[PDB]
Symmetry: D2
Subunit: 430 residues, 4 copies
Amino acid sequence: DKLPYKVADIGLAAWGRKALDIAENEMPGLMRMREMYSASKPLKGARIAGCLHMTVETAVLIETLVALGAEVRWSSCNIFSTQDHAAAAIAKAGIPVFAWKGETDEEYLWCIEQTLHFKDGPLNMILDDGGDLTNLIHTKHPQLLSGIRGISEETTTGVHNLYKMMANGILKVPAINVNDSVTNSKFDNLYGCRESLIDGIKRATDVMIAGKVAVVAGYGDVGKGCAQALRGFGARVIITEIDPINALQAAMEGYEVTTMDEACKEGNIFVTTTGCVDIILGRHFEQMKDDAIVCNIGHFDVEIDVKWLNENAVEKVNIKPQVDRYLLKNGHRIILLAEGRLVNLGCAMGHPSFVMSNSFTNQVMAQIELWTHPDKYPVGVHFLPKKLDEAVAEAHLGKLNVKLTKLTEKQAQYLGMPINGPFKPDHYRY
Amino acid sequence: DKLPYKVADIGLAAWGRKALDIAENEMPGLMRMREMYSASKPLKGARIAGCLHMTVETAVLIETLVALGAEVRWSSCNIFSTQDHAAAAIAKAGIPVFAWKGETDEEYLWCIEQTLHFKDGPLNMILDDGGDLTNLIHTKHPQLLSGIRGISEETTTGVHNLYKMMANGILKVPAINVNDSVTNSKFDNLYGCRESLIDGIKRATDVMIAGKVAVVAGYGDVGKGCAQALRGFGARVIITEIDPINALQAAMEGYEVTTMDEACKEGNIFVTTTGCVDIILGRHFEQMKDDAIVCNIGHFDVEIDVKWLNENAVEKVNIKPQVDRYLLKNGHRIILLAEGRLVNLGCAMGHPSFVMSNSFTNQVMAQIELWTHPDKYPVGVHFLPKKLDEAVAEAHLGKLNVKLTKLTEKQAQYLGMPINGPFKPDHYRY
Amino acid sequence: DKLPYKVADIGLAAWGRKALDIAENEMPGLMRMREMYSASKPLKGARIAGCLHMTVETAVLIETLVALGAEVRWSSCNIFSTQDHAAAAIAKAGIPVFAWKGETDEEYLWCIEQTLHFKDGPLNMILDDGGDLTNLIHTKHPQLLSGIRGISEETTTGVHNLYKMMANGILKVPAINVNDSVTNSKFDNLYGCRESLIDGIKRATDVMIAGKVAVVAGYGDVGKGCAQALRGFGARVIITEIDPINALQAAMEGYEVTTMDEACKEGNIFVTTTGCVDIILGRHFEQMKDDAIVCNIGHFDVEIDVKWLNENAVEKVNIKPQVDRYLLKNGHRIILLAEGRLVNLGCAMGHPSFVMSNSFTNQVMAQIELWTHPDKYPVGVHFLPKKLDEAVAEAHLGKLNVKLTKLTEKQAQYLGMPINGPFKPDHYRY
Amino acid sequence: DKLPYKVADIGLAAWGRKALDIAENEMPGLMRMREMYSASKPLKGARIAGCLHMTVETAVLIETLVALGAEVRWSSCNIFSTQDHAAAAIAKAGIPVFAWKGETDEEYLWCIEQTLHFKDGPLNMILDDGGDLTNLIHTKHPQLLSGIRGISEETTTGVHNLYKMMANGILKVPAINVNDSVTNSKFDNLYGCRESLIDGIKRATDVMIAGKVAVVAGYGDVGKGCAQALRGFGARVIITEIDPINALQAAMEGYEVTTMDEACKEGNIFVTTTGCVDIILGRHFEQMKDDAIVCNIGHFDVEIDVKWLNENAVEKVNIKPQVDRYLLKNGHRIILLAEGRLVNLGCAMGHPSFVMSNSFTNQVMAQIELWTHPDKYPVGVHFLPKKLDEAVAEAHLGKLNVKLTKLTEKQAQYLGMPINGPFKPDHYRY
Ligand SMILES: NC(=O)c1ccc[n+]([C@@H]2O[C@H](COP(=O)([O-])OP(=O)(O)OC[C@H]3O[C@@H](n4cnc5c(N)ncnc54)[C@H](O)[C@@H]3O)[C@@H](O)[C@H]2O)c1
Ligand SMILES: NC(=O)c1ccc[n+]([C@@H]2O[C@H](COP(=O)([O-])OP(=O)(O)OC[C@H]3O[C@@H](n4cnc5c(N)ncnc54)[C@H](O)[C@@H]3O)[C@@H](O)[C@H]2O)c1
Ligand SMILES: NC(=O)c1ccc[n+]([C@@H]2O[C@H](COP(=O)([O-])OP(=O)(O)OC[C@H]3O[C@@H](n4cnc5c(N)ncnc54)[C@H](O)[C@@H]3O)[C@@H](O)[C@H]2O)c1
Ligand SMILES: NC(=O)c1ccc[n+]([C@@H]2O[C@H](COP(=O)([O-])OP(=O)(O)OC[C@H]3O[C@@H](n4cnc5c(N)ncnc54)[C@H](O)[C@@H]3O)[C@@H](O)[C@H]2O)c1
Ligand SMILES: Nc1ncnc2c1ncn2[C@@H]1O[C@H](CO)[C@@H](O)[C@H]1O
Ligand SMILES: Nc1ncnc2c1ncn2[C@@H]1O[C@H](CO)[C@@H](O)[C@H]1O
Ligand SMILES: Nc1ncnc2c1ncn2[C@@H]1O[C@H](CO)[C@@H](O)[C@H]1O
Ligand SMILES: Nc1ncnc2c1ncn2[C@@H]1O[C@H](CO)[C@@H](O)[C@H]1O
């Protein structure tokens, strides 16, 4: 029970390494963190248990925490999101990794647990992207809690659960809600899904986007990026919403807002961008035009009533991996992607490296704070300082070559703000 | 010193009334406020002293506070923003108004003061769009303070000043920062300027936008709307910024971000969207291509070094009202609009009615809260509740015919939010 | 009957001249033609009878033909398109002009005739923008025909008529269909209306474009530009078409194509971009939403059933010049612009100078060809050579600063085309 | 030498059939052709020798000519474009096919030849996508010429060669230049590359498009679609052109036009869209930013100086199939895709089915004309009638659900055109 790592095939490393090379040039934030802190080794003594989809970009993250001098043990937060050659490299790198494609629920749980203990004791830091690493511990390894200094969550569902545990006096460790940074929120949510929604759809169906009517349920950040992605292609986007402010937003950009009920008749493509359930049900499926393409990029296979399909469907033919085509009792066909799960993760390579570098530099900064500024973070879920958000940004202005103008004493004075200090109030919405 | 009103020409009413008719159909918010509260007359006993550019939209605002039963005395917050026929109507309507186009600094001040006293005593409520109505009182009419229940500011410069006075124990009245509502911030800043930046430029120069290189300094809300407006026309927009998150924002939309110095060589059109000073100086002007069109939509004639022009310019020819053309010592001409002032306000009819309906419904709500819920607002600068913001929005979804989807018990539950209650956290940035 | 000119007020000149100055910097084409031919005076002995809306841009045109050494006599092709101060300048310039705003049908015809005879005999060249100058002659002044060397038409309706007369052996002069040049078709049709459709609507109604559903009948060039203009603002555009290729074109850009019948129910704004009649009829009007804004930019007040309005409308109130609002027997109002006429011409200053510079340089070239290469053009309607179209273009690449790459011997060869010669086949569609 | 077919693996069929099913729902044109002519069997007696990349869409094409009753023998016009499972199906279908992935030059030539003879004699009809099937015959099988009734080319390089042979009295068969139909040109060139440029780049590099500066050489149709594709993503596109009309075109859409020389310094991504050579050479490569991504979608590996790379490059590492990364003597890396060949064809699944359905229906129609109207087409290269172009379109308006408005006697008359007849002149450019 004392393995050094458990990946699909160690062989893949050489190639996995080829990728981490190309990818690193696209992740300025992490690479900067490496420069600025590789010497300081500000993470020494930290034993980080990371639970985040084991991909090429996470590899760059893992090697960045190590470079900042820290012990790390990783396990993918998803059973399918792993990239064996990515995990290959990290293993060959002499780093404990317990990740591989399509593992069983039992294997998953196993994987995570393998990151709990180091050879100098148990973990003292948690890096989560869903709270599985946090929940598991809190409820099965209470012992270790007193030994953990911090937790950095980056997911809505994880962050929330943190607020809950804290609200119910269960949280026994300070956490930093990384997800609510602007550079983390916008990228992981808006630019991220915008760049990879169609990729997922293309690789799956290779269908033409233009000229098609695409229904997008939810106008949040993710919904916004998808709506902008689909429209950039020539499709006519229709939006459904429950929040009147977001719905106004949509209408002001030219989209048509209506209910899924009315909408399910018009759509050609259907993307669900919510953390809500029962977005698309049988009464909708039976209205859809022949060969409608349904897929979800929200967060769980909980937005599409997949079950109904597998139930009220005549035949279910599998065109290919993660692309099935159900036959309705009315003659119409229904192309369902990723089996209802996240289409960009299930049909594409997830989000680009540059995007991840933004949400991941936030992650590296949370570790540093949490493990170097304990006094600053009492038990509760905290937010990263704004001056540090701007920091994640500025570190990316190089890659794309943008010349940032620098305020001047007079100006700064006039504005009443530090020439380098935070440039906006905390409630600023960008 | 006891006049009932002071407008340019009372005659204009008939026509001004023609406008308030057309205009009302474009301002659902306010018109809804009249429906929902015309009976309750929730503003009874309130004597509101309003200082907001006296336009056709403000007229609809004024008549809306009156319908909600309240005494009102108005004066434009600007010497040129007034629309004599709009002010005409309101006068004929038996409402004290002291506004007219281009008044003198002495007249302006005079105008404001005429709204201070009613025939039942002095004011008890303040509606400001710059803090001039607020400042003037606090420093020349301290008596009346104890008599004032609230203040509702809608301008950055006014809001700030409130925070200050409060910070220095000067503010002696609770205020509601109306400007930070989503439905007010976005419309008054983004959509507002987006709809009218080019209009002001067109009427002024009637120039062709497409094919031109337009330089926009500042990627805030206003900058965002102008950048989107100019690009929709075919211009190649370049942006300058001091904030690394806004600059990243820009770059992610395809714009080129650089410094004004480098930029002043390329630009054909120049729009300044900041609350900053010395954005465009002589060293820029002397770089600009022949016949460059310079104008500012920020907030004051403080962003362009007009002075330098009037100083280092050979001849200054006035093509027409609010449109001058300076001749440089190098052969290049410089078309300067609105004399450096707000171009949409000085070369156009400002923002549209529908937009105004949003930021103004917020205004009406602040009045009701502040004067119906004093207990709730101790002296300080407060924010309008979120459930109310959504309210301003929902009231506009009709005009544009958008079908809002309604959450369901199960859903609502799953999401952990009231089926009607606020759908988003307070830090939500939309 | 021998006046030297007939303009509204000669005084206006000083100001008209102010305009021609600013304007000339925006019309590189004509200004280049002036350089390249001011010396050659390639138009000597040519007596041009010009009939084109007498505006500031036409003035720059007029002075450009003269500079190329030619006698010119002008009359506007429209009774309202004229710009008195523009015509003023040209008169003070010692040039026969018979144009002024809103002249009577009898005055119009008069005006045209005054350009027929010079003090060395009658005209020998025709520059028409509607065929009124061409028709009039052919049927009332046959004598002069044998004396006229050429005709240059730039309008669909004028061009067609030429093809007809020619088809029926009536055409007695060679003509050059200038309208079908790329640089003239695209600018006068697409970029032209795109830049000024909304300006027209703003000045007229000052209404907010965003969030509205705009119906555009016809997806030709003009319709394409209007649809792109309206969408850049945030409106949701719907398109109607009779040609299946244009309709598919629309659908591939994300617009929704449907019939006016179904569309008339949704629309908030209505732009007709055809040369067809009966596009919007009573059965539509009685379907439109309250305060719908109807206007036409096609070519004649023949696309909207204005008549029906004036007939089946209860009351017709005139909000202001060129903006009326009919009241229907059902409670809905209808804002009708420019009285059914060209809205950009009737509510704005028409197209911008730079656009005009393109379609007018085409015009200047036709004159030169037709009058310097008679042998090349036998009686019939001809097209401007392609090498010359590219010429009109190359002449504008300077204003907007574009670095045109130059083919190289090896390349040119490989491509099989002249390094400077036409780069494209004649059926090329750009 | 009498094989019935030669494909990679016959087994693949079942799956290939799976595809042809899904695909057929996206190609309304061909599916319509099947309806309208399945009975007539208007192609009876025709023995078609098809040479077109053997993919899933060509499969649908092949089965469409057969359904119209015709013998067919196919061979891919490219050595790599073939799709073994697609070819699989067609073989299992009892159809002579000689296609498989990556065949040798000797094999290719062999494959083509296998379609020349049927069991009732040689071919009497040619369907070419490059003229390899035409050339080969004309120069090695002159006998058969007199036996061939028609040739339908769809490629620039093929069409041209036709005009040549004809110009040099070599062409001994009438041909129909299908490529110049609007529905074929626009789709195969504009919409086609627009939908699949980024897909090719994504699968290849999985790089993030937004925030990047993309250089596109050539503003033709393909260049136009690529430029619109990249911009919709958020990149800043810069264009290079030799044609002044296209360069103006670009500048009027907001792009920046300049020379490759100057541009090669700025670019992050480089797409070459010409039929020209030596677009990107060593002097450029040595200027490119680190990790620049170079790829070409023109028509041959002739636009990028690949050779130079393989010559002046230190090391060339192969990241993966069709994705190499050269290391320069200056430290910068250069990611070269598809080895310089067509990136959408070499890194993606080419163009979508719907697009192909357009350019392929054109193809089916040319066969019918050419083989049912010989008398109509004397030896020379002809264009498909316009009434038939609109036909290809109308046939697709269904899929996307667009309601085509139908002219009316009065209207039609007014317009002077047949209510169903062609709605536009031949020189119309859409
Ligand atoms: N797949 C990915 O790469 C990825 C990346 C980030 C986030 N996400 C997930 O996507 C989901 C949405 O994220 P977000 O940042 O846009 O959230 P968000 O909170 O900004 O927006 C969600 C939107 O859903 C709308 N909505 C809720 N219930 C609805 C219903 N029944 N019908 C229509 N609209 C409804 C809400 O009004 C809201 O505006 C989350 O579950 C999130 O974790 C996925
Ligand atoms: N004319 C109008 O109708 C109208 C309506 C609303 C607001 N405004 C005014 O416009 C201004 C901007 O408003 P906003 O809502 O976008 O503000 P904002 O705070 O959102 O953005 C201002 C932006 O300016 C940038 N900036 C500051 N100094 C700069 C400099 N020297 N060079 C380049 N960029 C610089 C900042 O980084 C910031 O992103 C304010 O003065 C505001 O009151 C005008
Ligand atoms: N106001 C201006 O500044 C200006 C400038 C140039 C041209 N025009 C005029 O605009 C008109 C259109 O010009 P264009 O260049 O786009 O012409 P166009 O020939 O390219 O397109 C006209 C379009 O109208 C469509 N159409 C015809 N009848 C229709 C109907 N009943 N319903 C729906 N669609 C219908 C046609 O299918 C066609 O695509 C002409 O009369 C032209 O002279 C006006
Ligand atoms: N890969 C595909 O799927 C696909 C599909 C259709 C066409 N094509 C090919 O793409 C190429 C271009 O097709 P198109 O329809 O756009 O052609 P096009 O003739 O419409 O445009 C080519 C453009 O290249 C420009 N150009 C030529 N030499 C240049 C140079 N040295 N520098 C800059 N610009 C230069 C020309 O001015 C012209 O506008 C052709 O070889 C064509 O066969 C590829
Ligand atoms: N390439 C990637 N590497 C790591 N995490 C990713 C990638 N693409 C998407 N994600 C993550 O997917 C999560 C949702 O499962 C998001 O929080 C997002 O950060
Ligand atoms: N038409 C209008 N009526 C009243 N205020 C306006 C109008 N257009 C713009 N404004 C105001 O101009 C202010 C800046 O001077 C903004 O806060 C905005 O709300
Ligand atoms: N400013 C202008 N000066 C001269 N002609 C114009 C102008 N704007 C539009 N036009 C002309 O309007 C004609 C249609 O009436 C078009 O052929 C176009 O060239
Ligand atoms: N999926 C496809 N099937 C067949 N031909 C294709 C496909 N995608 C692109 N092409 C062809 O690629 C050719 C250039 O090699 C184009 O003429 C185009 O029609």
